[PDB]
Amino acid sequence: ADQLTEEQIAEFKEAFSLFDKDGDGTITTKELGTVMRSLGQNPTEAELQDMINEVDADGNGTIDFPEFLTMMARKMKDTDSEEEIREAFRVFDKDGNGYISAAELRHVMTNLGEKLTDEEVDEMIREADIDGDGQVNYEEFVQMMTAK
């Protein structure tokens, strides 16, 4: 999703409420860089300070629970990931072999979804068909599409 949900908010409340040392429903701007990292993330000092500038615009030095949840809502996204792309190929590998054919990859791109262009299809074939030696080695092709 592009936005947060009640089942995510219910877990983030338990972490935020330990840093609510005043009991008023707020944390400080210095506890922000603690609570986001104690939730298992690791943003930079610069990314943390830029998210503080988005909520400390009133100059009060404090952050309410819904203002902290705006940072988490902005962090949710529908974009691509290796764990999402890998499952699409695993659904099409009906034999469970860890490889598919060039005919299957051409068909599943030209028939299903929106119909992919032949110059995009023939490139998607080329880089997998060379590596898997006449088969499509999808398990490593997942990485070659999104490595950084």
Partner: protein
């Protein structure tokens, strides 16, 4: 709505169009 097969195809197509964007820069209006 679309089928499980159709959204699985569109996930592979979107990842490949991102791979094409970083290779060929033809739609690099992002920056």
């Amino acid at each position: 709505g679309p089928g499980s097969e159709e959204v699985s195809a569109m996930v592979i197509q979107r990842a490949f169009r991102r791979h094409l964007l970083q290779r060929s820069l033809k739609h690099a209006s992002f920056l």
